[PDB]
Amino acid sequence: AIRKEVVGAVELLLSYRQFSEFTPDITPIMLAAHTNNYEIIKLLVQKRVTIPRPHQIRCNCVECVSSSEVDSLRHSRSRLNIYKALASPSLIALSSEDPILTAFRLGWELKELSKVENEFKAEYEELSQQCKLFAKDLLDQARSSRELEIILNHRDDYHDLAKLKVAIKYHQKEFVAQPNCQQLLATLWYDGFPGWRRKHWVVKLLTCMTIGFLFPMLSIAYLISPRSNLGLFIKKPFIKFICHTASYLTFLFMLLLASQHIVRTDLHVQGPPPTVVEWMILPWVLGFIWGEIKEMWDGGFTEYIHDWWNLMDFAMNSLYLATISLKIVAYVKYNGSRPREEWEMWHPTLIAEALFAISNILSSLRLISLFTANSHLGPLQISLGRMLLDILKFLFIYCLVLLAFANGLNQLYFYYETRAIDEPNNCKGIRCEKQNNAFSTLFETLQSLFWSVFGLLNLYVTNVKARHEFTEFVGATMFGTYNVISLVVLLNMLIAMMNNSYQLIADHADIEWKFARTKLWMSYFDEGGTLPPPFNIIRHADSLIQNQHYQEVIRNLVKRYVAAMIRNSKTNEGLTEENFKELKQDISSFRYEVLDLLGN
Amino acid sequence: GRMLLDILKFLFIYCLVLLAFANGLNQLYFYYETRAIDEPNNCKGIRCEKQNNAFSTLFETLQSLFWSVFGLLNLYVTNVKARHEFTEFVGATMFGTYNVISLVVLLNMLIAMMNNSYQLIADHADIEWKFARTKLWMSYFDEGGTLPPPFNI
Amino acid sequence: EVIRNLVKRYVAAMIRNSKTNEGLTEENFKELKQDISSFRYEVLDLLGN
Amino acid sequence: NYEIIKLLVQKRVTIPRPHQIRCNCVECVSSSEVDSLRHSRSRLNIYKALA
Amino acid sequence: RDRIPLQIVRAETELSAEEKAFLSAVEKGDYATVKQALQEAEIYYNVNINCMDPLGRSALLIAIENENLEIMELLLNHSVYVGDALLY
Numbered sequence A: 001a002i003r004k005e006v007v008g009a010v011e012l013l014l015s016y017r018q019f020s021e022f023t024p025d026i027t028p029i030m031l032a033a034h035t036n037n038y039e040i041i042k043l044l045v046q047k048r049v050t051i052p053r054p055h056q057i058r059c060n061c062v063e064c065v066s067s068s069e070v071d072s073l074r075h076s077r078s079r080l081n082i083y084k085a086l087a088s089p090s091l092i093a094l095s096s097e098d099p100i101l102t103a104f105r106l107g108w109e110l111k112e113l114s115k116v117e118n119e120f121k122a123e124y125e126e127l128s129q130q131c132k133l134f135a136k137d138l139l140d141q142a143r144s145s146r147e148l149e150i151i152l153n154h155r156d157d158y159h160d161l162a163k164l165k166v167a168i169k170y171h172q173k174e175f176v177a178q179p180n181c182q183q184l185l186a187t188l189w190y191d192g193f194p195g196w197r198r199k200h201w202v203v204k205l206l207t208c209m210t211i212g213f214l215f216p217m218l219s220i221a222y223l224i225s226p227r228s229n230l231g232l233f234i235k236k237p238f239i240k241f242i243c244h245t246a247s248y249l250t251f252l253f254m255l256l257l258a259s260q261h262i263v264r265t266d267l268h269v270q271g272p273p274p275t276v277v278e279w280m281i282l283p284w285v286l287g288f289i290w291g292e293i294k295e296m297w298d299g300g301f302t303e304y305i306h307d308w309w310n311l312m313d314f315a316m317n318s319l320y321l322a323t324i325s326l327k328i329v330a331y332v333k334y335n336g337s338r339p340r341e342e343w344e345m346w347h348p349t350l351i352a353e354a355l356f357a358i359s360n361i362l363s364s365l366r367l368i369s370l371f372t373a374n375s376h377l378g379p380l381q382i383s384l385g386r387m388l389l390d391i392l393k394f395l396f397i398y399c400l401v402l403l404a405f406a407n408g409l410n411q412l413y414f415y416y417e418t419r420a421i422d423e424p425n426n427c428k429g430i431r432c433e434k435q436n437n438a439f440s441t442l443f444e445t446l447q448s449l450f451w452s453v454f455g456l457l458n459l460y461v462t463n464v465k466a467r468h469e470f471t472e473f474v475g476a477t478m479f480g481t482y483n484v485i486s487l488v489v490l491l492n493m494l495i496a497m498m499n500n501s502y503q504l505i506a507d508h509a510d511i512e513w514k515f516a517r518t519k520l521w522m523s524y525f526d527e528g529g530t531l532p533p534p535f536n537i538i539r540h541a542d543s544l545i546q547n548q549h550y551q552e553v554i555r556n557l558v559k560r561y562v563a564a565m566i567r568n569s570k571t572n573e574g575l576t577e578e579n580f581k582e583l584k585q586d587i588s589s590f591r592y593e594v595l596d597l598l599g600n
Numbered sequence B: 001g002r003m004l005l006d007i008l009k010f011l012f013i014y015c016l017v018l019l020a021f022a023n024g025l026n027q028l029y030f031y032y033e034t035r036a037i038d039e040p041n042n043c044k045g046i047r048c049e050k051q052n053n054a055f056s057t058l059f060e061t062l063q064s065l066f067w068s069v070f071g072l073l074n075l076y077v078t079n080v081k082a083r084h085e086f087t088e089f090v091g092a093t094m095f096g097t098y099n100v101i102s103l104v105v106l107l108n109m110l111i112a113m114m115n116n117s118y119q120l121i122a123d124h125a126d127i128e129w130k131f132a133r134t135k136l137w138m139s140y141f142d143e144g145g146t147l148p149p150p151f152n153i
Numbered sequence C: 001e002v003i004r005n006l007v008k009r010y011v012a013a014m015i016r017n018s019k020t021n022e023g024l025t026e027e028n029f030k031e032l033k034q035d036i037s038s039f040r041y042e043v044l045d046l047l048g049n
Numbered sequence D: 001n002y003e004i005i006k007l008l009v010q011k012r013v014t015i016p017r018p019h020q021i022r023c024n025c026v027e028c029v030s031s032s033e034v035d036s037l038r039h040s041r042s043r044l045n046i047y048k049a050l051a
Numbered sequence E: 001r002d003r004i005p006l007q008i009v010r011a012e013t014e015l016s017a018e019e020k021a022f023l024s025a026v027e028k029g030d031y032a033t034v035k036q037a038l039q040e041a042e043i044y045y046n047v048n049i050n051c052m053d054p055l056g057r058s059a060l061l062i063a064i065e066n067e068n069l070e071i072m073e074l075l076l077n078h079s080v081y082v083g084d085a086l087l088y
């Protein structure tokens, strides 16, 4: 009578206090929670009931290891039943003290259990989703602004968003991507600009360029006096972003002058003194290093190592730091002048110019981390991030298919290795004008097979001297078999897999960009007074009142949510065969009693 | 008309990926710039019979990287004189890293995005052509007496 | 006059289209049960007394 | 419904009028900073009624 | 202690056993018993006709969802409280 949801029968049976369809462990309070009635649950909790408690993961008591080896198919069924009982919206909303903070801590440890239990993965996964819509609905049942301000600023045990920071360390992407939460913030990220309803392409485009140039005077004004009317004008979430973005293009433009010399001296000395352009770049580097080392202090080291843009900065700083020592060693050791055509291959002045060239590439490709603040380029980085999880497995197969062939060819041609002096123009290997000696050693046979994918390798490299004709045919066959497997069978699969992979991330491509830009904005809200890089080197009653105010809103929200969810059912449900029989029985009993009365 | 609203963003990314690499190579080879008279047949730059001086200035390093997309650039342009061997390896590595990013990772995305973009404009493709031809026809209905161009003076 | 006629025809057609392409639900079953219930009660009241 | 609307218009009724876009009267700028989640709900209701 | 107790944290008011048969008779169509409870509550005072069931439904919002136009005219000839009943 609890599986078929009737209310009179339950009460009637309560008052009068070898084959079944139910396992021997189901209890009434546990079975009334798998279904989602609200009036039946309230009748069984007014009498005293109880639900058991499941042990933590990886527990090692004698019971958990004794029972798990006497019956192993019955011990893996009770836990699923208990976890399906505990995770129902009505039971959470009826007997919990804080219904919002209990769906955060229980929808996070129903996903860990989805990894150690490979049998019920789908089940646990789907139970983990009923705990993410509940809080979203309970939030969007609000009717005013004071209620939002009361809810989002509740701290258990000052006035900052002390409950919007807990939803980010649990990865709740539907609770922080809602109209009201995304409208309360935009009225704080645009403080000091009372109206953004301006011409889209001219006036709002020009005001920012106008603000850009003023960053040095703004910085020094904040430095000399922080409480004036010109100071305190930089402590706004937008101006700091503008100044920090503008302090970078100057650095990236003061490097193109060092690549192509505007005016310099001739190049014959071992080590020259640094020129004027180089004298002014060290402050930026020192400021970057100081900022990096300071950021690691007021923050978790584990939190630091969890961002993937940090290794780029580490490599850039290392390659920038090596150059100073490599340039001072040659200035102190060597002296004099000599032509450039007689230096050694391992001269300090030559190895100190390759790293400086390599560093510019890793320093210029970091302007792709700014695409999250725009509406057009935003959803493109999130769709590109998925494409890079497809090439790994095909790369795994390709590396084996290449290591396989890199040995056979090397084993066959290692008898006819000539020298350099006996060859025209004293050139040995590929990259000459007339290519030769392409399959001699193991290091060249790996570069030739790579360069032969684009088409820059000729066919007359398989013709050997000494008149032997049977070997050339085997070599040509081995070279021709490798092309069909790589150019015709593999590249026709990457396309067909990426095409399918792209048509599954197109949906929910706006819920993952707003989370990113919100996490971006939340970094400048705090008062840190971070100057640009160059200038960077110079009791009871309260708690009682809050807890008293926080409960009424919860009560009202719960009432409204319950009523709406009850109403939605009666309108969107169809009929079935169970209904027809009851009507037939009604007519039947009516007929029988009327005939009984009238006939006799 | 819809296909031409897809190449713009990939072009935006490609222009940055090209401006990034157009500097590193130029910064490394600008010490060995020879002259024209000291070269065979008095030809300097690419488009000769024997190509030379392809990474000297910033204007040539932008045309070489473009022409190297179709396959009309050879491999012996990265071999420098003066016997220095450590530089040639870095140059070859910088030249080989740029090809994988442009020929294998980007052209495999334009196809996969245009394929999806085409299967959403197939519907309602007859309501937008009749509007155009109606707007065309409505231009001659008025009495303007427009003679052909030659007799129009 | 043309507007009047067009409005009449459109309204009538839109009303007619609804009655044919709509399904049933749970609200309907309860009213039928109540009809039978009240009929029964009043008939028993009359006959028994 | 068509029959229910005709019964309420035979008695005298009225619907308010929404201001134009980018209006800058004292009311539109005073009310939009005392309660900003209630002022953005009435306009949607009126525009759903009129259409 | 391996058990979890359960209880109600946000309590509300409840109904007596004399104000329940009234609302139960309203939901079935019985017309001769409701008319007697409406008359006994004017000489003696034991029932208030403006009670509210667990879900916020009173005696006049149960007769609108089950379309009964003969109990509405009976409940209106006696003075009941008509609130936001024209929007339902």
Ligand SMILES: O=c1c2c3nc(n2Cc2ccc(Cl)cc2)Oc2ccc(F)c(c2)OCCCCCCn3c(=O)n1CCCO
Residues within 6 Å of the ligand: A476, A477, A478, A480, A481, A484
């Ligand atoms: O020329 C070929 C070749 C070939 N498969 C071919 N041909 C063309 C050919 C056809 C007939 C003859 Cl009597 C001689 C050459 O054609 C086929 C014919 C039928 C196929 F089913 C097929 C390829 O595909 C099988 C898998 C590809 C193996 C390439 C080996 N393979 C190959 O390594 N060479 C290089 C030899 C260098 O002299």
Ligand SMILES: O=c1c2c3nc(n2Cc2ccc(Cl)cc2)Oc2ccc(F)c(c2)OCCCCCCn3c(=O)n1CCCO
Residues within 6 Å of the ligand: A395, A399, A446, A447, A450, A451, B092, B093, B094, B096, B097, B100
């Ligand atoms: O030859 C290559 C090369 C390569 N990646 C390769 N190879 C082939 C190779 C393999 C092993 C060795 Cl010991 C030497 C050369 O192969 C791989 C091996 C594993 C990969 F995962 C992979 C590419 O893809 C990574 C992204 C592509 C980077 C191209 C750099 N890259 C490259 O710039 N050159 C140019 C050097 C000119 O001498």
Ligand SMILES: [Ca+2]
Residues within 6 Å of the ligand: A292, A309, A310, A313
């Ligand atoms: Ca950093």
Ligand SMILES: [Zn+2]
Residues within 6 Å of the ligand: A055, A059, A064
């Ligand atoms: Zn256990």
Ligand SMILES: [Zn+2]
Residues within 6 Å of the ligand: D019, D023, D028
């Ligand atoms: Zn307004």
